[PDB]
Each structure stands twice: as structure tokens, then as C-alpha cells.
Amino acid sequence: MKSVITTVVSAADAAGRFPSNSDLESIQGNIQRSAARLEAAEKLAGNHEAVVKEAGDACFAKYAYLKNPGEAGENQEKINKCYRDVDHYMRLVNYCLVVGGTGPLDEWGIAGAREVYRTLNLPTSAYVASIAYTRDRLCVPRDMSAQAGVEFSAYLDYLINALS
Amino acid sequence: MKSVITTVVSAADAAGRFPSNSDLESIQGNIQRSAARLEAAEKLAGNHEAVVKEAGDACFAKYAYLKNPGEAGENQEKINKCYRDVDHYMRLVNYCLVVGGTGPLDEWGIAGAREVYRTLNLPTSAYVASIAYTRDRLCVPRDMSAQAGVEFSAYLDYLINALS
Amino acid sequence: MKSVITTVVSAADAAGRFPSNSDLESIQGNIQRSAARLEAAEKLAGNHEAVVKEAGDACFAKYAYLKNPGEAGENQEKINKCYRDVDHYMRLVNYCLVVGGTGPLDEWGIAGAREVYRTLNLPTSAYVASIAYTRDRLCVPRDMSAQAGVEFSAYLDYLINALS
Amino acid sequence: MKSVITTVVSAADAAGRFPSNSDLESIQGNIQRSAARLEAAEKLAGNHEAVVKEAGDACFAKYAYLKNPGEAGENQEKINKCYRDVDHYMRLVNYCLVVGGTGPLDEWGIAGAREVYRTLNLPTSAYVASIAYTRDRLCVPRDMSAQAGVEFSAYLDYLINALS
Amino acid sequence: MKSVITTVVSAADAAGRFPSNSDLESIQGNIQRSAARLEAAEKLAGNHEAVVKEAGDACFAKYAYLKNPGEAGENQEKINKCYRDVDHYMRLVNYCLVVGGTGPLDEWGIAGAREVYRTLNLPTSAYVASIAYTRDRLCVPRDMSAQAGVEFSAYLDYLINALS
Amino acid sequence: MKSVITTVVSAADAAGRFPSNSDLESIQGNIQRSAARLEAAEKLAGNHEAVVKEAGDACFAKYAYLKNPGEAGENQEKINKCYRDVDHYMRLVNYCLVVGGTGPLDEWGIAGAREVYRTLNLPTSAYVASIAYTRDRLCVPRDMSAQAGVEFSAYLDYLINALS
Amino acid sequence: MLDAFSRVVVNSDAKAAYVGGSDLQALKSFIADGNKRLDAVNSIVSNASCMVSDAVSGMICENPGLISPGGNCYTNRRMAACLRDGEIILRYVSYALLAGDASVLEDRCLNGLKETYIALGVPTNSSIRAVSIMKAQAVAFITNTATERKMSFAAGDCTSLASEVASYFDRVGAAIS
Amino acid sequence: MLDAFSRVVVNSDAKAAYVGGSDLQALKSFIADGNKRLDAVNSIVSNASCMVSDAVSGMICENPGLISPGGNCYTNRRMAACLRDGEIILRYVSYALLAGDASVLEDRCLNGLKETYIALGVPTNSSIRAVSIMKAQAVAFITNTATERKMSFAAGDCTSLASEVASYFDRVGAAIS
Amino acid sequence: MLDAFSRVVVNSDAKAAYVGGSDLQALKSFIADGNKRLDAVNSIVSNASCMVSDAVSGMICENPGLISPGGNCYTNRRMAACLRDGEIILRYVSYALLAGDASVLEDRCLNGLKETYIALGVPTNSSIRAVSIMKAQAVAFITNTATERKMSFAAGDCTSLASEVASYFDRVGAAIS
Amino acid sequence: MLDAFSRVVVNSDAKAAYVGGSDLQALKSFIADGNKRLDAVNSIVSNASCMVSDAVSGMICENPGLISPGGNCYTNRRMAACLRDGEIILRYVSYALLAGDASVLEDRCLNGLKETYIALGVPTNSSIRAVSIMKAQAVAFITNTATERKMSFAAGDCTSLASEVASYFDRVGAAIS
Amino acid sequence: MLDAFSRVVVNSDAKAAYVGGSDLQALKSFIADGNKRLDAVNSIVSNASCMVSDAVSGMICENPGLISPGGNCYTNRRMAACLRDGEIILRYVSYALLAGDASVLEDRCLNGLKETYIALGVPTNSSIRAVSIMKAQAVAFITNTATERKMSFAAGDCTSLASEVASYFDRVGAAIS
Amino acid sequence: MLDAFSRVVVNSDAKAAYVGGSDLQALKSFIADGNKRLDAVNSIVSNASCMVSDAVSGMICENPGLISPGGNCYTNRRMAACLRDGEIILRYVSYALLAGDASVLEDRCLNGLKETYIALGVPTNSSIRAVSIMKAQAVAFITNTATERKMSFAAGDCTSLASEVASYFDRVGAAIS
């Protein structure tokens, strides 16, 4: 799982090294930045149901052609899986904010996603609409502090860039 | 040259990745810890002649045998090379404190040292005596702050362990 | 460039072999099947403007959203690039029918297409709509013989599966 | 076993490909050439005993020194193994004509043959005499059709070239 | 070129080693055994025309078939090349006796010989006949000392085994 | 175990070769040099206790600082292990003289020795003093013949060079 | 790998027998019906993407726990691996149908798959359902009885080819059970 | 590779000189401006897909010959390689900005790139135009003056960081010109 | 590998749960006490050479047959391998203490070690004594109760870190017994 | 590698042009003359051992210095390498004739052969003589006019196929001259 | 690998003992009789080709089913592999006789051979007959009692060397039974 | 690689000439002087660590700029590489003296060393001084005239062996000048 700690430990292990000063100094970075990302995680944890509804709503508002025959939101069951997926991604963003790294998105949401969405004919622009709507919906400091919003926004952009 | 920055950049490069949040968070540790190690670097830069004199003197005090014909310190020019070497190491400790990692010791001081000291019949115990005497001679808070002292000590201990 | 000939020559080369009976026998299939696919190639060469117009029109008919600001077909120059791309693909289908293999589609049409369409935000569903509409629009025996139609269909289906 | 089918399937498998048009077109070559090679196989199957006697006979007629002490046909048991070997090769030629490929000769008769004949001091010119006599004995269309004789002759030449 | 010296030097080099006692001790065997093999080399150098004449004559005596049209010795120029080849081999045996190893036979006589004799239809039995006749014709003590004869025989047997 | 025999056999095995003349010639070197090295081995076997006492004695005579606190001969138990080690090395020199090769020293005394002596802070100059004293103590032909002393001295120098 | 022709040759070689007229009536018929076999393989490879996605989607909609946490299609990484395996298995079955022999499927695909799935924790029972759905698809395409697509063929009967492709699909579940 | 700090150390070691208070003012300022540099790097990485897409599309709309036959972006394979090269260059420029030193860019990206592009027939002039568009985008994002997207920052001067990234982009064109 | 944070995320992912305030009090405390954890790791890595040589020397002085002929530390080659293994094990334990999770130690060091030592004839009972001596050393260094060295710390209590490093040492003997 | 057909496609793609009836007459003739091309290739491959043996022996009897000491065919090792090179060249010429295009020959055989022969001291002039003898043999076999062996063909004109193979042999001498 | 000398050293090292006069009478005799041992190895390696072909031919003429279909020497590929194995085994036996120790044969040839032959279906009983024929050949050559060849030796007795080479041949069947 | 004997063979093969009594006098003398050559090689290998240490230290005390910053022996890494190169050169010179031929030195050491040193910035002039000091040491040891150590030899003339080793050292400086 990519994090501050796993990066420096994996680098030490590649070189057969004990932890040294630059490794401790990196982890001091955790202590400093953690307050901001944990605030983002807690806010997301407490309000994900409402965030996810707005996100899925924006997707189907932008791309009404999804609800047509043979398309990806053609029945209520397929629409429900669309909201579930947006929830899945917001739960991985929550995890990224707790770990302090992209590892949860990387391993559990992005790896294989191009192959899956291509094979199941799920348009990536639909996912990007949901994620970008959430990114742009963010209101600071109404919804969280400035630097919690910087952390949250950074993972949302990371996911958009990974789908593009 | 191993530092906080080169470690996370090197890891990003091996995976073909842009910098991401754990990389930035690592480098924030740079910001937090820099005052302590630059304090130690400036003190060592300001007083290295005096530190080196004490360290070389401690070597020859412990190992009078070095001055015997055949031995590593048999004449005044060889003794002067010994104090030069201790100054070389203290200069690399200054560099490690500026970089915030072991890179300068590793590249310019430790790599090949075993081969060199073995081949030229320079006893590793003498070098350890000079470094250990300097670590033990450090006086907090007389010489520097506690956390400057931890940074200084860490690099002296790193070198001792590298020679052992 | 994958064809009957290059496949058996490439296999002979990897084993350091002269051509032998199975190689010659493979190429005899070339002789048998050529009339059907050159029939399909000449028909497509003779009428590609009309075929491409119908295919692009079918794309925009199915996905009116493409014409919306931000979308792939937001202005007339982008719409004209879309019909150009469909013509590019139909020209590679003509080439596959002349070569008697997927080489021209594989090398000049499919390799890198996933990266390109992902990066420029061109929905793969639109391209599939144009190709599928052309496959479904084929009229045997109005447009060509049954076996010309099988050859034409096979390359359109190959491209659809490559995009899916 | 090298054949039209195994060549194109092994090529598809190397590239992770489904069968495509050039592979089907190669196998259409089977359907076209099969009549000629199956006629050769059936004629050989029905008359191999008489073919093999003429072949072994020609070998010992050309190379009477084989029947001398310490040489390869020095007793009746060794002469009998010589005819058996010629039979073995004609049975592999029969198999090549059925498979439509050199695979049976390659795997069961040629691979290792240089090592065996060298170690057992069996002169390859003796085998070539038997095979070339059979090749040159062929009378078309007395013994088979023109293109059955082309198929038969091609495997006999393949074997001669493999021994030379 | 395989000899006592090149074997132990090559082994020292592969391990990055200076010569050591087993290497020097090996080369002392050089000193002990040299008289016997230089005796054999000088005898062969002194009388090679006579030896080669007997060896080629023995070839054609055993295999009169060689003189038949189509065969390896069908005309006088081909017969003269055969005696030349036997002289080439006896010259390489002289070299092996000077070097004290199989290097000259291995490099200049044996490597590629199987491919050459197979491709030009030169029966290996004829070459073995010439070499074997020479080994069997050796007369100790008429021609050389017992241990010169062992050295000479060893290289003739080495070549026979290389051709078998 | 490196010896004349294992060197030539390992070389033959690398090349898939039977033993040949240069290999037998190397082993004839054994027969020639064995008398000298076996005399050295027997003399060492019969007097190692007195040789080892002089050797350890010379080490502590040269390097009295060893008997100081925190140094390698600081108590009687550590001094006793020092003599034991010198005995270990003389027993491996005995083995080298019997095998006719460095293999026993290489495998059982040198491999890992730099790592062990570095980690346990045992100065290599102390071992070299013991070995060089023994080398220089040697009196020919009082203690052994000229060429037994050449063999003995060669292994002692081999060990000194391996520690330097 | 063997094809329908080299299979006969291997069986004949075991008896040191020449392949004669007596032996060739299956192979001459194999050749006679060869156009049907090319059509059958074309009908599969032309719809292979849809077959795999529909079959894996069907395995999941009947057993939704496969996409719950701890489920073996949970995460995009696992769903992609499963879709890849569906495509690999269909590709080897299509080679077996093109060659008229199971050896390429058994040798290159099925040999070691059971032990691998057990090691990875890939549910073999769910794998067998995915394969059974692809078997029903392929039988429909070969016999031009798919509900959602028709393709173009000369009038005749491909029931033997449909039975044969089914036998290759059945070997997958026999291997991994 | 070196960073802003090990660059100073390399310059000092050349004179066998300790790094002292005199020499550290730039480095103490580098540290004090550290949050801005982390923001600058975030502003680029957060928009990196759009930058590359837009920069390469831009190079093409200005020189539509690149996508004619015999053009170097003709075919999907070539276009994908070009977009890949735009992303690689932008990646190494972002490393250089994070490190405050060009060495990772010069050593791992630009070393031997001119020779590669020459061998491949990659037009170095068109490449430089793509890079100049990414320079224009990067300066706009660092200074929060992009026309189509603003991001969140405490107000302050980032002129130096914009000047520095522009200098890294300029090295690419310098290396392959 | 996992760290204290990704361990929590893995446990939450098994329940398809978001990590909320309810869940974060261990991790916020982990962060609060982070300076102590850095000091603990520093206290080990600063004395690692002495720890390994003293521990292996102690295993040998209690069981001198280890350095007799047929003994598994006999010859410099074997003593060097054993010292290397002591250093490797301590390095993996130090990573586990830095990360607040055993996964790097279990995955990269302990997985396959028992089977390896059995194959090589490395005595696991003597290995466990070496490790128990390093456990006592590390607990002394972390709590600044070593007899032969003191190091520099702000006043407080590291008993939880000492208990945690002991648990990582104990996993080594659990693996190889 | 390209064949007669993908060569036409490459030329057309250079003009973004469909291949139509105008362009196909050569290719329809290539197809109609296909059995003759299969016969031509059979006539060469069926005699390939004798061609190489005879061509290299020929180069030598005309220039007996090649087998003197310091000659490049002196020793069995050198002679075997030369016969190997004759067989390789003949193999790639036979591929070119099967394909109706020189690309496999130019790209996989002739690319860098001059530079190799230069480095090795392989006489390019003697090589060209060996190749000219194989050209003479190949034309004789394709036209069934070899003095020492006739093969079985339906009577017809193979002039074009003889001219083409001669053009492939001529490229070898062109590449290494 | 060990030789007669290093075998003694290994046995002495197990007792931490110096090799003294007491211990050396076998090795001094080994050296005294060394010329006989060189002659013995020469007598084998000079006839090795004939030994292997005669032994494999003998195994087959006593058990002709080995060359019937399904037989493990059927096909030239299998007969060549079997002849290769006969040569490999004889080469390792000759090394053991040159060194006066079985370790090279046991370590490099026999370790893993039984498991390999069982895996491949190589009949171990027939392998042991081939080896027993080579044992009889080698004993005849060493003692100059072969019927079809005499070689040249100083008068004396090599019965100990013949017994020793027999013991090395016997280890092959002990390994694979 | 060649030795004194295979060098004669290579010269003779160039004239297709047997080596006879005329040609063997040098080689019979090489054999008769063999014990001296083994002694010469022993005198160098037995002092090889001191030679390299002293030769490289010598190069430095005469040119102390080599260990200034930007010097090529500055840092432990560089000094270790230089001492390594001194030992490698001395190793290949000792092989040449053992063999009585320079080929192992020219082919495996000196081939491409000038180009390497040029690329690396290794000063070829300082290298030649190190090699000239090792030449001076080697001649002193072969002739037992070293000032600080004598070894044991039967008295005799080793002038030729000293001249030969000096000629090998001289080739190094010739190759990299």
C-alpha cells in the first residue's frame, strides 16, 4: 500500500539498509500533514451518502443518453450499480486520506479499471462527471478547512487523471 | 545522493508516476526537521578545526602503537594524513546535515573504504576511535540544541556502524 | 504486417527453416479466398464516401450529446475529424481485404487507439456505433456476394472486438 | 506436430490472438491440397512392402562394401534393420502426407538422426541412396497422379536434404 | 587454445584469482611429460609425407567405392584433396603434441567438421579409416619410445572419438 | 575444493569433455610436487602446538594494546580464542599442503573472514603478525627441506595477501 | 499440439501402422465439412468480446457475493483478471474447434489451472458457471440460434460442430473440479 | 540525481569547503518557501492529463501535416507514442520542480533524447512547440491564472517558482535543438 | 506491505466501511506519539552493529558446540552468514517498528524462513536465542536502560513501544519453531 | 516484413488512397500465377543442400587461395560458417520469392551484413561469387533446365519468376559490395 | 567436488585433526600408483565412443521392445537422448576414477537422476543394464583384457583400479533403483 | 589465449608447416627453464598486495593532486577502483609470465582499456606511473634484489624472466598511451 512509510521502507529494503535520517524525516511529514487529511476523511465518512447521491445525479443529468436501451443506465438495477461504484470510489478516497497515499485507489479502484470499463462498455466520461462534480461542489470552509479541501481535491484529481 | 527528495522522486520514477500526496507529505518533513540539522551543520562548519584536532588526538592517545615503525602513523606526514581524513569525514557529516540524508557519507566516504583501509593497512579501530570520541564529546546544550545533537549523533553513529 | 504469407514465413524464420509443404498449402488458401475479399475491397474502394457519410451520421444520430459544449463533437471541425476517422478505418478495412489479414488494422488503426481515445476524451462507443452501423447496413446480395460480405463483416467485427 | 493448423494456432497463441481471417484462409489451403496428398498416402499405405524392398535393394546394390566385416550390413540381422529403417521412413512419409506437414519426419525421424547414425557408424549416403532411388523410381501417372507425385517427392527431397 | 597452461589461467581468470600452488603444480606436469610428446612431434614432423601416403592408401584400399562416379573420390583431384586432408590432420596432431593439449585439433580440425563432411558428402568412415590405420600402424619401439607412442596414440584416438 | 584435480575436472565438465592429455599432464604435476608439500604438512602436524604458541606470542608482543579494556585480548578467554584461531589457520595450511591447493583456506578460513573480523572488531594486523612471524621464523633445512619451505611459505603468503 | 490429422497419425504410430483408405474416412469428411468448421470458428471469434463480458456478468448476477468484500471479483483488479481468464479460456476452446482436437486446450490452458486456482483462491464452481454460459453462447452462434444476433450462412446443419465445441467447454470444468 | 541541497554540497565539495551560514541563506529560503513549491507541484500534477492532451493537440492544429500520411503523428500508434512522450517530459519537469534542481531531468530524460529523435525521425521542432505549450500551461497553473480552472491557495508570490519551471521546460528544447 | 494506517483501512474494507471518527483514535494517538516512535527506531539503528555481534556472540558463548566441527557457526563462511542473518532480522524488525505493523517482517523475512533453515540445517533453537538477546537489547535501548550506553531523550514513557518491538521479535521465533 | 499485397497497401497508404480495381490487376495476376510461384519455391527448397554445397565448392575451385592458411575458408570451423551463410542467404531469398517482396531479405538478412563481413574479414567479393552461382542454379531449377536434375510441372512460362529470383540474389551483392 | 586428498582433509576436519604421517600412507600410495591411474583413465577415454554405442546396442539387443512403438528408445530423438545419457554417465565415472573419489559423480550426475527418469518414464532397469555393460568394458580396458583392442602398458597389476571403477559404475544403479 | 607453445603453433600454421627439431630449441629451453618461471610467478603473487598498495601510494605521493577534489583518486570509491585496477593489471601480467605469452594480457585486459579510461576520465599518464612502479617491484622480486624482502631460491640467472615481465608491464603503457 503506497504511503510515506511504505515508500521509505521499500526503498531501504531494496538497498539492504536500516532506516536512516531521511526516512525518519519523511515520516515527520506524516505527523505534520495528518490533521488536514484526517479532517477530510472524517467529513467524507459522515456525509458520503449525500455526496454520492449528488455525484450520481450529476452524471445522469449530464448524460441522459445513459438511460436509453442498450446503454449503461438502461434499467434501475444498472443505475443503482452506478451510484454503488461512485460510493466505492468515495470510500477509496476516504482510505487514501487515512493512509496519506494513493495506495487504496491504485490497488482497489484504478488497477484493471480501463479493461473492466472497456469490456462492460461503461463510458469513463460518466465516472469523470461524477468525480469532477464532487471536486467542484466542494465549498471551503463550509464543508471542511482549506487544507482538508486541498487533500480531498488532490485525490479526486488523481482519480480523474487516472481515468483520462 | 540519498535525501528525502531523491528517495521519493527515485520511487516515483521506478513506477513511472507523477509526484503524489505521500511524496509531498515526505518533503514537508524536510521543512519540519531542517532547523535542527542546519543548526548542527553551521556549528560544525564554524568549529571543524577544533573538533578534528580533538578527534585525531583521541586516536593517537588510545593507540600509541600507531607511531611505531611499520605502523600507519610511523611519521609526521602519515599522522597529518590521519587528521586530514578525520576532517574529510567531518566535512561529509556537515554535508549529510545540509542534504538531510546519508548520501554524502555513502557516496564519498563509505563506498570503497573497507577495500582502501584493508589494502593500505589502516586499522578501522583508529577511525572509529576518532568518530566515537567526537560523538561522546558532544555536549548538549553547551555545543548545540538537543535536536541538533540528535541529528549530529545519528550521522556519527551511522559512520561508526558503516565501519563496523 | 500479418497475412497468410508473413505468418508462415515468420514461423519458418523463427525455426531457421526453408519453406515446406504446410507453408505452400497455407498460401494456396490465399488463391482460393482472394476473389471474395478483393470483391469486398473493390466495392468499398468504389463507394467509401457514401459508406462513411452513413456511418458518421449514425454516430451523431445515436449520441446527440456529442454536439454539446465540452463534448468530442462540440464544433463543425471536430465533427469533420470524426467522419475523417471513420474514413481512415474504412480505408484500413480495404487494406485488410487486399492483404488477406488484420495487419493493416492492427498496425495503423488498433495499436495505441485505447491510449489515444482515453487521452483525447473520445468515447469508444461512438466509433463502435459507426462500425456496427456499417456491419448491420451491409445488404447481401444487393452490395456484394455472400462470401465478400463474410470477409467485410469479419474485419468490421474484428475492429468492434478490438475497441471492446 | 507441424501442419497448416498447428502453425497458425501456435502463431495466434504467441500473440494472445483469437483465430482471424488469415488463419481461416490458411486452413482453406488444407481443403484444396488434401486430395493430392491423401492419394499419395493411400498409394504408399497399399504398396509400402514392395517400395521398401526396392529401396533397400538399391542401397546394397550401390554400396556392396556394407556387407563386409565391421561394416553396417555385415550380417543378415543388420541388413534386416536397414530395410526396417527404410520402412520407418516411408511410414513417416505416409504420416507427413496425412498431416499435410513435415512434423512426423521432423519429430520422429530427423531429430537426433545425425547423432545416432554418427555414433552407430551408419553411413548417411546409404539412407540417401534408398530415398533417392524411391524418388527417381516414381512413375506418374502409373503410380499416382501428377500432384500426388509432387507431394510424395517433396517429402522425399525434404528427408534427403535433412540428411545432407 | 586448450593446454595445461591455458586451462589453469582461464580458471584463475573466471574466479578473479592470481595463479596459486595448484596452477604451478599443474604446469610442472608440463615439464615432466614434454620429452615424450616432443619426441612424437619431431618424428611426425620428420616423416609426415610417408605417414600420410600410407594413411590415404589405406582409405582407398578399404573403400574402393570412393573412386566410382558420384562418389567423394571420383577423380584424381578429389583423391589428392583426401591425402591433403589427412596431412592437415597429421599436422594438427603434431601441434597437439607441441602444445600438450587438444586445442589445435579442437579449433582447427574438429569444430565444424560434422557440418562440412555432411554437406560435401564426405563419408566420416573414410577419415576414421586413415586415422585408425595410422594408430594401428604405429610400431613401438621401432618408430618411437613407448611413452611418445602413448601421446601420439591418445591424439589419434581423440580424433577418431571426435569423428564417431 | 580447489586442487590440481578439481580444477581440470571442473574445466572438462564446463565444456562437456572427457578427461584429455592436458588434464592427465596436470595431474602428473601432483606426483612430482607432492613429496615437498607432504613433508611440510607432516612437519606442521608434528609441531603445530609449538608453532602456534610462538605465533600468538609474537602477536601480543607486537600489539600489547590488545590486552587493554574493550580491546580484542582484554581477558584470558579472548586471548585463548586468539591462539585457537592461529591453530585453526595452521590446520588449514596443513590441509592446503595435503590437497596441493588453496581450497581449504579459501572455503574454511578466508571466505567470510573480512565480515567476521570487521563485525567482532578483531584487527586483521594481529592475524597478519601471527602469520608473518611464522613465515619469517622458518629456518631451512633445520625445520624442513628447501622445497617444503617454499610450499609452506606460499600458503602463509597466500593467507597474508587474503587478509590485506 | 495435435490437430484432427496428427491425432490419427499418433494413434497409427502406436501400432506401427500406415494410415490407409480404411483409416481416412473421418479425415476426408473433416475436409468435406471444413467450410462449416471455418464458419463455426468465425461465429465465435466475431462475438468473443460480448460472450466473455455477458458470461462473467451472468456468473456475478446469479452469485452477487462474488463482488462483495472478500468476494473473488471484488476490486477492478480482480474483475479484470476474471474477464482476462474468460477470454483466455474462450481463445483456447476456439483453437481446439479450429484444429478438431483438444490437445492445445489441455496442454497450454488446462494443465496446472486447478492447482493455480486453488493456490490463488479462485472459486472453481463459479469459474465452471462462466464457462457453461460461454458454452450456451457458442452453441447458439454456431447454430445461428442467438436471439440478439444472426450471421450469414449457406443452408445446412452444424449440430456436430455445436456438440464438439460443447465437449471442449466441458473439458474445462472436468480439469478444475 | 541531486536536489537543491545536494547541488550546494557538490559545489562546496569541489572547493573542499564546509557549508556554513554564509552559504545557507538560499537553502533556508528554499525551506521557508517549501509549502509554495509543494502547491506548485500539486497544481501541475493535478492537471497533467489535460496539459499533455491540450499541448499535443495544439502542436497538431498549428501544423496539421503531422497527421497527414508520412507525418510523424499519423496512425494511432504514433499519436499514442507522442502523447506518451509529452507525459514523460512533463513527469521529469515535475520531478525537477519538486527537487529544485534539473539533474533528474538532464540525466534520466534529456541524455541521448536528441540522438533518439534523430534516429526515429521525430521532428525536434514540433516537439519543442508541444513543450512550449506545456510551459505556458504550467506557469498559468503555478500562478493560478489558467483561464479554464482555478485552484485553492493562500495568496502570495509564486513568480520564482513559475520562472524556475519555465527554465526546466527551456532545457528540453535546448537539449534536442 | 501495510503500515498502522493501511492495516485499519484493510480491516474497514473487509466490512465495506468508511474510516470515521469512531475508528481513528488509535491512529490519531499513533501520530501524537510519533516523535517517540522515531526516537525508538533511531535508538535501535544507531546501535545495530553492536546488537548483532553481541547477540550472536552470546548465542555462541552459551552453546560453544556451535563453533566446534559440524557446528552450524564453524568456519568464517558460516559465522559470516549467521551475523548477516542477525542483521537482516533486526533490519526487518526495525521496519515493523517504524511502520507500526508486522506485515513487512512476516511477508519479506519470515515467510519461507523455517523451511529454509530446516533445508540448510540452521538450528532454529539457537536462532531463537540470538533473537531473544536482540529483543532484550532493543527494549533496553528504547527505554534508555542499557548499561554501556545512554542516548538523548525528552522525559516520558516508551513502555508501549518497548512492548511492541518485543512482539515483533517474538514473531521470529513463532515462525521458525 | 511485407508481401506483394501489403507492399501495394504501403504505397497506397502513402497517398491516403483506397486500393481499387485500377490498382489490383498486378495482384489478381499474382494470384492467378500463384501455383507457378509455389512450384518455383518447391524447385529451390527441394535442391537447397546441393545448391549451397555446389555454390561454395565453386567459389573455392575458382579461387583456391580461400582454403590456403590465412584464407577465409581455411579450417573446418570457417568452411562450416561459410556453408551456413550460403544456406541462410538461400533461405531468405526463398522467403522473398514466396512473399513476392524483398523486405524479409533486406530487413532480416542484408541489414548490417556488409558491416559484419567487414569486421570479420569475410571477403565480400568471394561471397558475391557464391551468390551468383546460387542465382544460376535457382534460375535453372525454376525453368526446369538444370543439367543434372529435372522435376515435374505442367508446361508454362516461368520467365517472370526466374527474373524475380535473380533480382533477389542481385540485392545480396548490392548490399555487401 | 572432492578428490582422494580433500576427502581425507574433510574426514580430518570433522575431528579438528591435522593430517599427519599416521594418516598419509593411502595418499602416498595413491601418488606412487598415480601413473597406473592416468593409464586407466586414458584406456577409458580413448574407447569411450565405442563403449557407449556398444553398451546401448547391447541393452537394446537383449530387450528389443525398447525400440518398438511406446518403447523408451523408439524414434531417433529418443535413441539420441539415451546415447547422450550413456556418454554423460561414462564421463562422470571417468572423472571419479581420475580424482579417486565418487563426489563429482554423486553431486553433479546422480543427485536428482532417479526422480528425473521417473518423471520422463526412462526405464531405470534398462539404464542399469547399459551401465553394467560399460562396467564390464571399462574393467576389460583397464586390465588390457578386451578381445577387440590391446593398448600399451608397462608390466604390472591394475586390479585395484578395475575394482574402483566398478564401484563407481555400481553407484549409478544404486542411485536410480 | 595462447601460451609460449601455441604461439609457435600459430606461427607454423600460417606457413602450413610442421613444428620440428629446428623450431623446438626455444620451447625445449622454455621447458628446461620452467622451474625458474614457476619461482618468478611465485615471487610476484606472494607479494602482490604490497606491490599494488605501494605502487598506487607511490603514484599519489609523486602527484598529490590525484587526491585533491576533482582528482581522479579523490573519495574512497575512486581510490578503491584505482587499487582494484592495479591488482587486475598485475593479475593479467602474472598470467602472461606464467604462459610465456602476452595474449591473455592484450586480449582480456588491454583490449578497449584506453577507450574506457578516456570515457571515465582516468588519467592514462598517472596509470602508466603506477604500472612502472609495479615493473620495478616485479624485476626486484624475480631477481631476489628487493630491499625489504628476500625469498628462497637455488642460485641461478633469471635475467630473461625479469626482461620478459618488464616487456609485459611495458605493453600496458603502450596500449593506453
Author numbering:
A (entry chain CCC), B (entry chain AAA), C (entry chain AAA), D (entry chain CCC), E (entry chain AAA), F (entry chain CCC): 1 to 164
G (entry chain DDD), H (entry chain BBB), I (entry chain DDD), J (entry chain BBB), K (entry chain DDD), L (entry chain BBB): 1 to 177
The authors write:
Porphyridium cruentum is a red marine microalga, reservoir of potentially high-added value molecules, such as carotenoids, sulfated exopolysaccharides (EPSs), B-phycoerythrin (PE), and lipids. Carotenoids are well-known antioxidants, also able to counteract many disorders, from type 2 diabetes, to degenerative diseases or cancer. PE, the main protein found inP. cruentum, has a good market value for different reasons: (i) in biomedical and molecular applications for its natural fluorescence; (ii) as a natural red-colored protein to be used as a dye for food and cosmetics, and (iii) in the pharmaceutical industry thanks to its antioxidant activity. The analyses revealed two major bands, whose molecular weights corresponded to α and β subunits (17 kDa) and γ subunit (30 kDa) of PE, in each lane.
To the best of our knowledge, this is the first time that PE was extracted and purified with such a purity grade by using only a single purification step. To determine the protein identity and purity, PE was crystallized, and its X-ray structure was determined at 1.60 Å resolution. The X-ray structure is constituted by 5990 atoms, including five phycoerythrobilin (PEB) chromophores for each αβ dimer, one methylated Asn in position β72 for each β subunit, two sulfate ions, and 324 water molecules and refines to R factor/Rfree values of 0.222/0.256. The structure confirms the formation of the (αβ)3 hexamer but does not allow to identify the exact location of the γ subunit. The α subunit contains 164 residues, the β subunit 177 residues. Each αβ dimer has five PEBs in position α82, α139, β61, β82, and β158. The first PEB, which adopts two alternate conformations in our structure, is covalently attached to the side chain of Cys82 of the α subunit by ring A. The second PEB is bound to Cys139 of the same subunit. The other three PEBs are found in the β subunit. They are bound to the side chains of Cys61, Cys82, and Cys158. The UV–vis absorption spectrum showed a peculiar shoulder at 498 nm, ascribed to the phycourobilin chromophore of the γ subunit.
